[PDB]
Enzyme design. Structure first.
Site, PDB file in Angstrom:
ATOM      1  N   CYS A  74      30.972  39.455  44.913  1.00  0.00           N
ATOM      2  CA  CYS A  74      30.871  38.307  44.009  1.00  0.00           C
ATOM      3  C   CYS A  74      29.895  37.247  44.475  1.00  0.00           C
ATOM      4  O   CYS A  74      29.348  36.539  43.669  1.00  0.00           O
ATOM      5  CB  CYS A  74      32.258  37.674  43.738  1.00  0.00           C
ATOM      6  SG  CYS A  74      33.111  36.855  45.134  1.00  0.00           S
ATOM      7  N   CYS A 156      30.817  34.432  42.302  1.00  0.00           N
ATOM      8  CA  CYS A 156      31.529  33.423  43.059  1.00  0.00           C
ATOM      9  C   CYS A 156      30.575  32.806  44.093  1.00  0.00           C
ATOM     10  O   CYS A 156      29.467  33.289  44.295  1.00  0.00           O
ATOM     11  CB  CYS A 156      32.742  34.056  43.713  1.00  0.00           C
ATOM     12  SG  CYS A 156      32.323  34.977  45.217  1.00  0.00           S
TER      13      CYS A 156
END
Ligand SMILES: *[C@H]1O[C@H](COP(=O)(O)OCCCC)[C@@H](O)[C@@H]1F
Length: 251
Positions: A74, A156
């Protein structure tokens, strides 16, 4: 003598190409060993065969999305806008960063066109709807919107975006990056969006991080409670030199 639509038709041998790309991808990438490529193709077909090519929905692609489910690191996502080749060159060498086209689903569809015809199972190899001239809810456009949203949702930490500093609008709010990806980054997970603004030939002085469209991007991202960072890649050849050989003492 006349074509139904304005856009290029389905890529020749589309079915065989998609299946072959799936086989290759699932051979190379060990986490995708579980994937049945015939099932992926069946799911892909099911999205658009026998459907009016101006009436495709994200739900149509749900079976394919489910089968092409993939965990992506991520914190290692590289988004890009209007600068595909450099982004791919970069991740071909910097193998621990990933663009959408490095995922199974992005890999399958990269540089291809496809559409069907309403109430007949035929693939249209003559023409397909152009997003602007014909309709937006077409098989190709809807696919990219759906997978791009899911990819942005996966990100992320620090997410990077490569932008083309030689274009009229370095950040284009109407691009897929600007209209889909920016708005689907999850503020709960994404700390920072960092833009890399790639300069054109020999123009190596302008601070393009002060460009009006970059200030616009900064404002949009900031108001989503995500931090914004920007770096100039003033001299792209040196950047390429250094990614390819980072032990090079000039880097
Ligand atoms: C999701 O979208 C990005 C590429 O889209 P661009 O921003 O290149 O839009 C293409 C259509 C312009 C009208 C990339 O990060 C990923 F594929």
């Amino acid at each position: 003598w006349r074509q139904t639509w304005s856009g290029p038709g389905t890529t020749k041998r589309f079915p065989e190409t998609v299946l072959a790309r799936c086989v290759k991808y699932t051979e190379i990438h060990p986490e995708m060993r579980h994937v049945d490529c015939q099932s992926v193709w069946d799911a892909f077909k099911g999205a658009f065969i026998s459907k009016h090519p101006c009436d495709i929905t994200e739900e149509d692609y749900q079976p394919l999305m489910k089968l092409g489910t993939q965990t992506v690191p991520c914190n290692k996502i590289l988004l890009w806008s209007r600068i595909k080749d450099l982004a791919h060159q970069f991740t071909q060498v910097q193998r621990d960063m990933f663009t959408l086209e490095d995922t199974l689903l992005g890999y399958l569809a990269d540089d291809l066109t496809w559409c069907g015809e309403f109430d007949t199972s035929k693939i249209n190899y003559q023409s397909c709807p152009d997003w602007r001239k014909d309709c937006s809810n077409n098989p190709v456009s809807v696919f990219w919107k759906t997978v791009s949203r899911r990819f942005a949702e996966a990100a992320c930490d620090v997410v990077h975006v490569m932008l083309d500093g030689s274009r009229s609008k370095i950040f284009d709010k109407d691009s897929t990056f600007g209209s889909v990806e920016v708005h689907n980054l999850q503020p709960e997970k994404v700390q920072t969006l960092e833009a890399w603004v790639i300069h054109g030939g020999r123009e190596d002085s302008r601070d393009l991080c002060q460009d009006p469209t970059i200030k616009e991007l900064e404002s949009i991202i900031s108001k989503r409670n995500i931090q914004f960072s920007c770096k100039n890649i003033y001299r792209p050849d040196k950047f390429l030199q250094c990614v390819k050989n980072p032990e090079d003492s000039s880097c």
